[PDB]
Structures are given as structure tokens and as C-alpha cells.
Amino acid sequence: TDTIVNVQGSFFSASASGVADTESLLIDPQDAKFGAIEIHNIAHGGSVDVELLTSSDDTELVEDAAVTLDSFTGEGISQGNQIEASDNTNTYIRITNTSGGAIDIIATGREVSQ
Amino acid sequence: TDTIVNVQGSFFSASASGVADTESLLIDPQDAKFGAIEIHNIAHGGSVDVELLTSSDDTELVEDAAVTLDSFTGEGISQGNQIEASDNTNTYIRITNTSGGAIDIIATGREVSQ
Amino acid sequence: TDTIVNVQGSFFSASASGVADTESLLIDPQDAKFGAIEIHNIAHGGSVDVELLTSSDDTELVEDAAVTLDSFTGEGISQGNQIEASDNTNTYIRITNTSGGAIDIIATGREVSQ
Amino acid sequence: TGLNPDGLGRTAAFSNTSAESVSAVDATIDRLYAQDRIEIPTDSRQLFSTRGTVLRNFEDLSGWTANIGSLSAETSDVYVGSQSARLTASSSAVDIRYSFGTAQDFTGKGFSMALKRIDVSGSSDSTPIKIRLVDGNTNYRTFSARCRPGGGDEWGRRDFGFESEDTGFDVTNVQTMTVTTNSRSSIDILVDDIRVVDSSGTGQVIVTIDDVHTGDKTAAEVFGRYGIPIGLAANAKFLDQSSSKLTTQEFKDLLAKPHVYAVNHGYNHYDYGSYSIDEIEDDVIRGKYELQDLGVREPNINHYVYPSGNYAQESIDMLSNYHVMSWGTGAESFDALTPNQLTSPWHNLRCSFDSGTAEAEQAVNDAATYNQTAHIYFHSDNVTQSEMESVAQTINSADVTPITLMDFYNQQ
Amino acid sequence: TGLNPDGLGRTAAFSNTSAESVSAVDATIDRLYAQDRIEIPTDSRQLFSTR
Ligand SMILES: [Mg+2]
Ligand SMILES: [Mg+2]
Ligand SMILES: [Mg+2]
Ligand SMILES: [Mg+2]
Ligand SMILES: [Mg+2]
Ligand SMILES: [Mg+2]
Ligand SMILES: [Mg+2]
Ligand SMILES: [Mg+2]
Ligand SMILES: [Mg+2]
Ligand SMILES: [Mg+2]
Ligand SMILES: [Zn+2]
Question: What's the half-sphere exposure (Cβ side, CA atoms, 13 Å) at D268?
């Protein structure tokens, strides 16, 4: 029969260096080519809160629904997530510093079709 | 041999801000393009009961079968589930507030073929 | 219906023999054909720190964000991870020796589409 | 979460996991929330076996003379040392005697012996065995225990309850020790290693109620009128079966009372011989966890009372993974009675007072008089309120400390 | 089995698991079959030093 090689779907990442004490990385699925994302990894650099938000606006974040998903302490990686967001459902992931000092946040995952 | 890049199938989400004390988010697979869903994530904002229902009606929820899948307490996310529902099998997922006050519920997953 | 055989997407590996005490294997997704990678396996020969870095430069490593993901002790393999990096997001994985002597590092995984 | 652990096979780094069952070879847990042990770390079987001092070792039978029956050195089958004494008799009792080289003083001492049944038959399959002291005046004093099938099928120490005394027996001037049985068509029993333990402390009483009958409510009031503690030997399946057995809320309410405690008696009362060791182990395990869900915590739930009093070394071996101490059954005052220091927490009995209070009230008076521990039991359906009041007033008027099973095990 | 526990990172609801080695920070176990302790809770070093 027909043989096909499956290569895995588009890589996605968001990052910020030196995120100040109460500030955040906003992971926006508008930055994806397919307009939806699934974050697998959060490499957190220090303590963070992860938060999932729905916007009232199609293009900007004006908070409607907001749920604090989890809190991470110290430096490390949250591996094996499936936190999902899309542009058309106006969903955003916010990773907020809670360390008391500046940190580096890297989030990686995959683009998903809308 | 032929090489293809697989991007993953359509993102699905349901959400409600300010779900009142005993009220619910009804996740309806009729809102999916493919007419079936697999919910991976329930981010719940406060305590909830998750419930899987079959309807007597093709298009509206008139309860036939109902099973309480699990109870979640406080704020957080249940991540990486596979709770599954389709339009043609008239299956619905209800997430019911049990907090004593208003909560934000975001449910995400993937569309599945019927 | 049409039947296809799916073979899995391109194998990726980086390796170094005799990595000196404080030195590192720099896993660069620029070496991938698809320009992104997912490392599953780190076989480490002695103690190592695994680190995820964003570069300021499109093509060379100038550290911007850096997060130490995890520390591995003694000889063994961390198997079935999903640490991810791409060229266009300027993401690098560094595996740094911490053993007090020379080690062999083999990292394997899969190429991912950008 | 971190990266995956070192190793081949399936390895995973998780944040939060839930499981019904986890099997692990190594578990490294930084903070443990596991108050409900099923398997206990302690193996009580041989801890107490070598307390006190060996009085008669039976390692040389030159000092022993058969008054009746027959005696030999058993070298093939030995509890302790080089040999044991085989006691054999036909259509008769056995009675064997050792003369002490000087007047022994046994004030405040209690007695214990190793025993194995090979065969006993006739009017019964079983016999009282009596340690029978003789004074400088040829008065006797007697302590006794029961040789039975099952419980006696392998070597196990008995700790001897007081039984009788010839009035004016001089315990400071003991001249001969005698070991003796009832008469039977066949007797073939091995003995070894008589041990002396200090029992000079106060006499003690333990009260157990079996099988969770509704009368446990009146029992709690009655024994409560003198603050005597009750052990409910509890079967968790029996709760809410019938009007005749306690409700779950009644059982919880009972255990909230400061003198009531619970010990395991198997979820569904599976007794030895009636069911396989595996079925009894499931009954033991389920009893333990169901009672733990009802709030019965560690020192209490480390005790088990044998269902229908049936046991063997097979059941003791299995039970030792889950419990530290167990109690059988008997009809007479010496069955309740032990020294305060046990040498087996597994082979000792309890006196029933279902069939009238006499032998138990004798045991309570002897516990006071001879400085011993008495374990008495009943089912609250068999016993009238006036009988309970008789026993309760016997205990309150006697010179004994009423104690829990937990207290008794902590003293060992 | 139920649904997956609260949290980010890899979370899983299992029925029966087998492992060679388990590392946990918190372990909530409703019924423990672990009679064979390696690491004992008691630190005897300084208990008796002031008898
Ligand atoms: Mg939008
Ligand atoms: Mg809100
Ligand atoms: Mg739109
Ligand atoms: Mg339908
Ligand atoms: Mg129904
Ligand atoms: Mg239809
Ligand atoms: Mg680049
Ligand atoms: Mg930095
Ligand atoms: Mg570029
Ligand atoms: Mg011997
Ligand atoms: Zn019983």
C-alpha cells in the first residue's frame, strides 16, 4: 500500500527574558499561523502563575473569563501540558511572575488547526 | 517516500464567565464543525460537577442517561482528559457550578469526526 | 476507504564524546531539515544540567532567555521527554557537563515542522 | 514537573497523579499522608517468646519422674535447645514431677510453657494442661492452659492462668513442680521451656464484646457506670444488616464514648478451618480498612479477635502481617487468666460469660488475688442487663485495674 | 478511574499502576501495604542524651 512519512505539526513558542516581578508573558494564539495553539512546556525560570483567559474583543485582551490554572514554584519545566488557546475563541494564556525578582519564561508547544 | 506535515485537528472550546451558583456550562458537540468533540481540559474557577448526558432529542437536551463523571474542588484545571460527545449520538457534557458563588468555566479540546 | 502506512517523522540526534567538565552539547534546531526539534532522550554518561535558551541572534547563540530545565545525576537516560526548539524562534537546548570529568552525551528525538 | 526520571522502560515525570492501586518496589515519598496502614511493620510472633527466665528447660530428664503416664526426650522435634519432653499416656492422665534442690519462692511470679499437640483422644480431642506447684506442706497451687487441635498443631507458648489453690499453700516455700493433664484414651503432647515472668504488679481486667449485636448500647451504659473499657470485636459487614446489629451511626457514636474501643474480628467473621487462609486474609484486610474508614485508628486496629475463636499457626503467620495480638475462647476461669507479662500475644484465650457470670467473676477475683490479667468476653444478645451489672460491680469492687488491649500490649 | 487530577504538568488518573521506583513529594494513600520500611521515622541520636 501507500507509505507516507508523518512529520509533526508546526512548532510554537512564546518567550520573554527579564519579566519584572508582577509582569507577565501573554501567549496569544494570534501569533500562530493556524490561529490555535497547544502549550506543552512551560520553562518557568522562577515562581509563576499560569492563567487562562477569554477576551470580550476579537483581537485584544479585555478579560471576560479568567481561571488561574496552576502555580509553579522556583526554576523548572512544566512538561506534558495540553493548555489550548485559539484566536477565534479569543482565548489567551498569561504566565505571571511571582518570584519577587526578574525571570525568564519560555513556553513551547504546537500549532493546532481552528 | 512521500513526506507530509501533520497539523492537529480542529481546536474546540466552550466557555462561560460568571456561571451562577447551581448553573452550568453545557458543552454541545453541535457547536463543532465535525459534530463530535473530545474535551481535554476543564479549567473551572471554583468547584464543579462534570456530567455526561444523553438526550432523547436530536437537537435539544432532554435528559435520557446522565452520569456524574467527577467532582472538582476549588480553582484549577483538569488537563489531558478524553471525555467525548457527538451530535448524532446526542451526547452532551455539563459542567455544573457547586461553589456557592459565580465562577468562570473554560473547557477546551479537539473536534473529532463522526 | 484509502489505506496509508504512516512512518514516523525524521529522526534527530546530537552527540559529543569526551565533553570536558564545564563544557556543553549545544543542540541547535538549525541542524534539523525542518528547522525545529523535539528531544525525547538525553543519555548523559555522567551528571548534567539541561538548559533551554533563547538567542538575541537569528543564527548564533547570544543568550537572552535561559532556564535550567533539570539536573541529572550520575550515568543514565532521561527517556520520552518533549523539550522543543526551533530556528525561527531562536531556541537552543544546552546540555552542560557537571561531573568533574569528561562524559559522553547523546541526545535523540524528532524533527518537527516550523 | 521536571524532565523524565532516569531509566529504560516507561518512565514519566508527573505533577499530580491519581490511582486506585499502586504497586512499587521503591517509593521515595518526601511527605506521607498514610495514617491507614494495612500491613503493619511489627512481627510480634517471636518478640515475647523469650521474655523472663527459663525455669525448667527439659534438656536433661534426670530430674523428672512420672507420677502417672510416660515421658521421653524428644530429639527429633525441639522447640528450644537440644530436646523437648514428649509426654505420652494411654487410658489415663499424665503427671510428671521435678523436685527443686531448695525451697523456691514464686511470690509475684507467673508461668509460661511451650506446647505442641501430636494426638489427644477419648472423651475429648483436647485437654487442660496444668502447671501444678507443690509446697513444703503438700498443698498444691495450680495454673492452667488448653491444649487443642488447630491452635496446638504447631509449637506455641501458653501463658498460664491461675486455676486453684489448696488453702494455706506456701508460695514462698515451693518444693516440687508438677505438669499434668486430664485423663484421656490417648495423650501425645510435646512440652519444652517453662519460663518464669514477673507478674508482681496490679491485677488487670480486659472486657471484649463480640459480633456487634445491638445490646452493645446497654453494655456501654452498664460498664460505663464504673468506667471499665469495652473492646468491640467488630465485623464491619454486620453493621446495618438487621435490627439485631448496630447501625453505622450507632457504632460511630459508641466509639466516641471514651471507654469504648474497636478491634478487628474480620469483615464477615470468616473463621479458621471454615474458609481458606486466602479468604480469611481478605476478611482481615477488609475488616481493617472498613474499620479505619469508620475512624478506628492504629493502636486499636492493631488487635484482632479470632472469629469463632478458631486459629492455627497458619492463621497466626498470615495475621502477623496485619495485627500484633489475638485472642481465642474458653469456658473457664483459667482461660481468661494470664500473667501480666505474656510470652505469646497469639495463643492466649478469653473466658466467655454468655453462659452465666460465675467463671468470669471467679477470674476477676483471681486476677485481683493472684496478680494476673483476666480477659472476659460476651455477646450482648446472649447476656441480660442484670448479668452485665453483676460483672461490672464485680470488677468495680475487686482490686484490679480495668484496661484496654492497647494498654496491655504497650506494657509487654 | 475518574478524571485527571487538578494541575498543570503531566497529570493522570489511573486505575492500576506498577512501578519499579516512585518518587513523590506528597503521597496520599488511603490503605498502605508497606510493612518493609527502609527509612525509619525515628531519630534516636539525641532522644536519650538527656536521660
Ligand atoms: Mg480572536
Ligand atoms: Mg471572572
Ligand atoms: Mg471570529
Ligand atoms: Mg444530535
Ligand atoms: Mg438516569
Ligand atoms: Mg442522527
Ligand atoms: Mg533562528
Ligand atoms: Mg536570564
Ligand atoms: Mg526569522
Ligand atoms: Mg528444649
Ligand atoms: Zn464473632
Answer: 9
The alpha carbon of B7 and the centre of ligand 1 are apart by a number of angstroms equal to 20
User: CA–CA separation, D395 vs D364, rounded Å?
Assistant: 6
Task: Determine the residue type at D81.
Answer: G
Q: Residue C68 to residues C48, C83, C96, C109, D2: CA-CA distances in angstroms?
A: 11, 12, 10, 19, 10
Instruction: Report the run of H or E that residue E8 belongs to, with start and end.
Output: none
C-alpha distances out from residue D279 to D286, D318, E5, E31, E40, Å: 11, 11, 34, 19, 32
Closest CA relative to residue D319, chosen from D357, D368, D369, D283 = D283
Element holding D335 (H helix, E strand): helix D333-336
Min distance C42 CA to chain B CA atoms (Å): 25
- D134 annotated to a ligand binding site: no
Resolution of the experimental model, in Å, one decimal: 2.7
- d(CA D297, CA D294) in angstroms, rounded, equals 9
* Chain A residues whose beta carbon lies within 8 Å of the beta carbon of residue B109: 84
Cell of D332: 473457664
Q: How was this structure determined?
A: cryo-EM
Sorted by sequence, the CB contacts under 8 Å of residue D258 that are 6+ apart come out as: none
Please give the distance of CA A99 from its chain centroid, rounded to a whole number: 18
Flag if B104 and A67 touch (Cβ within 8 Å).
yes
Distance from CA of E42 to the nearest CA of D (A): 14
Q: How far apart are CA D393 and CA D402, in angstroms?
A: 12
Classify the phi-psi angles of C72: left when phi > 0, otherwise alpha if psi is within -120 to 50, otherwise beta.
Answer: beta
The distance from CA B75 to its chain's CA centroid, rounded to whole angstroms, is 17
- Identify which of C81, C103, C78, C77 has the alpha carbon closest to the alpha carbon of residue C25: C103
- Residues 6 or more apart in contact with residue D253 via CB below 8 angstroms: none
Residues forming beta bridges with residue D96, ordered by sequence position: D66, D179
CA angle D169, D173, D178 (to 5 degrees): 70
Pair type for strands A2-8 and A35-43: unpaired
- The answer to the question of whether D265 is labelled as a binding residue is yes
Is the separation of the CB atoms in B75 and A67 below 8 Å?
yes
Amino acid at D11: T
Whether A77 and chain D come into contact, CB under 8 Å, resolves to: yes
Closest CA to D372 of D231, D228, D201: D201
Q: Do D3 and C77 touch (CB under 8 A)?
A: no
